Design an enzyme around this catalytic site. Structure first.
Site, PDB file in Angstrom:
ATOM      1  N   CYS A 163      57.119  51.908  38.021  1.00  0.00           N
ATOM      2  CA  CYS A 163      56.760  51.913  36.594  1.00  0.00           C
ATOM      3  C   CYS A 163      55.402  51.121  36.546  1.00  0.00           C
ATOM      4  O   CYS A 163      54.472  51.574  37.239  1.00  0.00           O
ATOM      5  CB  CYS A 163      57.853  51.412  35.600  1.00  0.00           C
ATOM      6  SG  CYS A 163      58.678  49.836  35.993  1.00  0.00           S
TER       7      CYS A 163
ATOM      8  N   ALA B 227      55.176  46.911  36.078  1.00  0.00           N
ATOM      9  CA  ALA B 227      55.473  45.806  36.978  1.00  0.00           C
ATOM     10  C   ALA B 227      56.463  46.181  38.112  1.00  0.00           C
ATOM     11  O   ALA B 227      56.588  45.418  39.093  1.00  0.00           O
ATOM     12  CB  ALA B 227      56.000  44.628  36.183  1.00  0.00           C
TER      13      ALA B 227
ATOM     14  N   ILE C 254      59.927  46.481  37.822  1.00  0.00           N
ATOM     15  CA  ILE C 254      61.168  45.721  37.773  1.00  0.00           C
ATOM     16  C   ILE C 254      62.100  46.169  36.639  1.00  0.00           C
ATOM     17  O   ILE C 254      63.312  46.159  36.846  1.00  0.00           O
ATOM     18  CB  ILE C 254      60.887  44.157  37.766  1.00  0.00           C
ATOM     19  CG1 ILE C 254      60.119  43.701  36.485  1.00  0.00           C
ATOM     20  CG2 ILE C 254      60.135  43.715  39.023  1.00  0.00           C
ATOM     21  CD1 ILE C 254      59.798  42.247  36.358  1.00  0.00           C
TER      22      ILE C 254
END
Ligand SMILES: CC1(N)CCN(c2cnc3c(-c4cccc(Cl)c4Cl)c[nH]c3c2)CC1
Length: 500
Positions: free
Chosen positions: A431, A433, A435
């Protein structure tokens, strides 16, 4: 257990706590009572309290006048070892955590629960050292520690002991010795220094009683039950993130600072992808902000490329023999770059350092575009392999999809692609970051994989799976909304399987 986090406090209660029980440099964090993903860091400085907002929309914790972080514990660790300023420029120091005594977010806390209820749960689901703390029904205000001990049929080799815990002037004790400021302090003490019975039995508190493992058949009842709390099950998981402060020293190196989209969102050393065969002229050529995620099919969880990490991303794909990429952001959202374009236009060929990528064909579905890419090392034709990039395009800018059908159909297609390719390496998932949406997609994929192979009569445990993925990259699954969406997706998958 995350003790500076106070789950059920107002803003003025936070002020009064810091002003009466704290000093300058004292701090606590707390959630908003109405918005999840709003949090407040409350800090005492010069005899007054400042409240600093932290927002999470799904990608990271965004501290106003500060950095972006993968978890609140990583945020607190960062500032206690460093940097935080107001609007003005004045330093705000985080020195002294103000501890919370509330047990309601602990895995072992059961509130109103009877001795026979607790015994039957420990008999059916517990093993040696399984324990819980409940409210005393005979002695209002008091509590009871219930512990199974035994061997590991009902042959009398195992038993359930009940240890009364008195609460006296807001301190806790087991009848003698030390008086504790909280049930958590008492539990941690007797976890380390177990009680021994008269005749020698050690009352070892090895693990809390598991209340989250469910048979997949019974997903709908668990979802209905949780819809009246998902927030409360999530925050108990969030309380365990204190346990996952693994080192991120490589990501912290000066030579690697430019390779991180967010300076404090970093891969754990013990699971980072190490890149080999780099340019000798590049001083550190082994680093990418990426982790191997191995359920205990594997994954690489990584960030959206920066302009200067595109070549490293392709080095990674080639080296790990990845054949499927999942992208869970558009290139741009809310006017901000979330992932640079690291693939060529349709029918075009581009060189990314030593790697060559052809975009053979794009196919548009409702929720995604598939790009069939061909990756090879320049100068070595026979290294060509197809890499299938599945670019999910409809995820909303904040929150989660209202229906999981789109994500599930996408993941089913990704799964069959991966399974069709002999010896394919890990599936790359990224995506912004790497996470929040990345962690959600990987956890859904992991859970669905179990049900795909073992059918509807298999055990799943959503928070336990998430904690296991969170030990391999920081903050995998960011929000309550994603948490709930994972359950909803698993429910919808079970229903489509039952309809067949
Ligand atoms: C009655 C209850 N108050 C209901 C909620 N109960 C509960 C238990 N366990 C978890 C986990 C969890 C599961 C497996 C591993 C890890 Cl590390 C975690 Cl944190 C996440 N949320 C949880 C909520 C505790 C009793």
């Amino acid at each position: 257990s995350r003790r500076w986090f106070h789950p059920n406090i107002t803003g003025v209660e936070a002020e009064n706590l810091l002003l009466t029980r704290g000093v300058d440099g004292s701090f606590l964090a707390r959630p908003s009572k109405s918005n999840p993903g709003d949090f407040t860091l409350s800090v005492r400085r010069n005899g007054a309290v400042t409240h600093i907002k932290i927002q999470n929309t799904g990608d990271y914790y965004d501290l106003y006048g500060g950095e972006k972080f993968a978890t609140l514990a990583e945020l607190v660790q960062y500032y206690m070892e460093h940097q935080l300023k107001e609007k003005n420029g004045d330093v705000i120091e985080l020195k002294y955590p103000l501890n919370c005594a509330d047990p309601t977010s602990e895995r072992w806390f059961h509130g109103h629960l009877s001795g026979k209820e607790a015994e039957k749960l420990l008999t059916e689901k517990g093993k040696h050292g399984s324990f819980l703390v409940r409210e005393s029904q005979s002695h209002p205000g008091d509590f009871v520690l219930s512990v199974r001990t035994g061997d590991d049929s009902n042959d009398g080799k195992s038993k359930v002991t009940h240890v009364m815990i008195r609460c006296q002037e807001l301190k806790y004790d087991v009848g003698g010795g030390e008086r504790f400021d909280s049930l958590t302090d008492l539990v941690e003490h007797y976890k380390k220094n177990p009680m021994v019975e008269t005749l020698g039995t050690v009352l070892q508190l090895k693990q809390p009683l598991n209340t989250t493992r469910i048979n997949a058949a019974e997903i709908e009842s668990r979802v209905r039950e949780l819809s009246k709390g998902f927030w409360e099950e999530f925050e108990t998981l969030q309380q365990q993130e204190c346990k996952l402060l693994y080192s991120r020293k490589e990501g912290q190196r000066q030579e690697n600072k430019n390779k991180n989209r967010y300076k404090n969102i970093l891969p754990f050393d013990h699971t980072r992808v190490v890149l080999h065969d780099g340019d000798p002229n590049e001083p550190v050529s082994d680093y990418i902000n990426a982790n191997i995620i191995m359920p205990e099919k594997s994954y690489i969880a990584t960030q959206g490329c920066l302009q200067n990490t595109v070549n490293d991303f392709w080095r990674m794909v080639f080296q790990e023999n990845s054949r499927v990429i999942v992208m869970t952001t558009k290139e741009v959202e809310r006017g901000k770059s979330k992932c640079v374009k690291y693939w060529p236009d349709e029918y075009a060929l581009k060189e990314y350092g030593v790697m060559r990528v052809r975009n053979v064909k794009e196919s548009a579905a409702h929720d995604y575009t598939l790009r069939e890419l061909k990756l090879s090392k320049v100068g070595q034709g026979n290294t060509e392999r197809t890499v299938w990039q599945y670019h999910f395009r409809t995820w909303p800018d904040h929150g989660v999809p209202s229906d999981p059908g789109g994500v599930l159909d996408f993941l089913e297609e990704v799964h069959h692609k991966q399974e069709s390719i002999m010896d394919a390496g890990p599936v790359v998932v990224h995506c912004s970051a790497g996470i929040g949406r990345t962690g959600t997609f990987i956890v859904i994929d992991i859970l669905i994989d179990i049900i795909r192979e073992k059918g509807v009569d298999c055990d799943i445990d959503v928070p336990k799976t998430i904690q296991m993925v969170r030990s391999q990259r920081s903050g995998m699954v960011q929000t309550e909304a994603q948490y709930r969406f994972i359950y909803m997706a698993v429910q919808h998958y079970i229903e489509t399987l039952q309809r067949r």
